[PDB]
Design a protein around this ligand. Structure first.
Ligand code: CL
Ligand code: NA
Lengths: 63, 8
């Protein structure tokens, strides 16, 4: 890749507040904030949208 | 609230 840390979705997720992101298994993200708890703010690569995601639904792309 | 569990 280009050097930025990326995470991948392990499962589909449907958003539960206006500030959450919906995503498919296999989606890639840049993580923007992982400091305020277990909901992380992320940017989706295929959509470009930003929002919270549940951190248990993602894993680093490296492996 | 914590993250929800992975889907069924
Ligand atoms: Cl979008
Ligand atoms: Na890097």
């Amino acid at each position: 890749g280009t050097g930025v840390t990326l995470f991948v979705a392990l499962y589909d997720y449907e958003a539960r507040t206006e500030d959450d992101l919906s995503f498919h298994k296999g989606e890639k993200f840049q993580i923007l904030n992982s400091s305020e708890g277990d909901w992380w703010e992320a940017r989706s690569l295929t959509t470009g949208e930003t929002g919270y995601i549940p951190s248990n639904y993602v894993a680093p792309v490296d492996s | 609230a914590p993250p929800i569990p992975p889907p069924r």
